[PDB]
Amino acid sequence: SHSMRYFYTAVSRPGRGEPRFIAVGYVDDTQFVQFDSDAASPRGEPRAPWVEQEGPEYWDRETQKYKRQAQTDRVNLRKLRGYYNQSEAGSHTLQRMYGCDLGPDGRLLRGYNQFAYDGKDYIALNEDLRSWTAADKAAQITQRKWEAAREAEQRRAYLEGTCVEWLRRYLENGKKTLQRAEHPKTHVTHHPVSDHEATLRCWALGFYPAEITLTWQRDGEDQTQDTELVETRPAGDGTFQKWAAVVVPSGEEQRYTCHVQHEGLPEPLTLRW
């Protein structure tokens, strides 16, 4: 599978006039574009080499969309304030996430388009790309407005058509990085904790994409309940890191194995100290 996803954040600013609008777009775990309304001369900006090659017409049309979008979010934040009978003195946040998944066959699998207000679900396009789910009575006003305007058909046309074709173009033009998994580099460290206990920590570094599974087993039985996992985290160079740690009696280290599942690995990995 592969996906293209766009993430919009609009935040009102009492007194500072216009809200700040920020948009980022991803293919899988790779960001390729940024737009920020507070920038000196707002423009769509490349974040990956496989769109830097796109010409000025591409970037002019993306910029024009972002600029219109930011203008519409100002209106949206004002309407939402009316819907919830909220004051102008407070700051509020409107978020939108949308995009398309491509199947293992290269066909559209699933499209999405959903919104949140001050951190809670507001309205979502259903998987049929034809009807809406509203989270509350305010969002039901929006739903009726969008049913009347046939908003879902507008979004469906993008999600089923343009979204998929862009994703295919990007996957081809960036195939050297987007379609080549980078396997994790792995190793286990050892840190005494007491006279009879030691931490074993299994590391996975430099992997792409971010999806990974790290497990500790003792005697072939998962030690899930006593394993500390950190969230998968970005290395800063486009790859990711994760580790799992277990506290172990001094002497029983040889009883523990770390198991690593990642798509860049031909077979799952088993490691020990």
């Binding site: 972002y66 939402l80 929006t142 407005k145 969008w146 305007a149």
Partner: peptide, 9 residues
């Protein structure tokens, strides 16, 4: 490539 702009909320 981003979506165009649709109906206000």
């Amino acid at each position: 490539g981003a979506d165009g702009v649709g109906k206000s909320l």
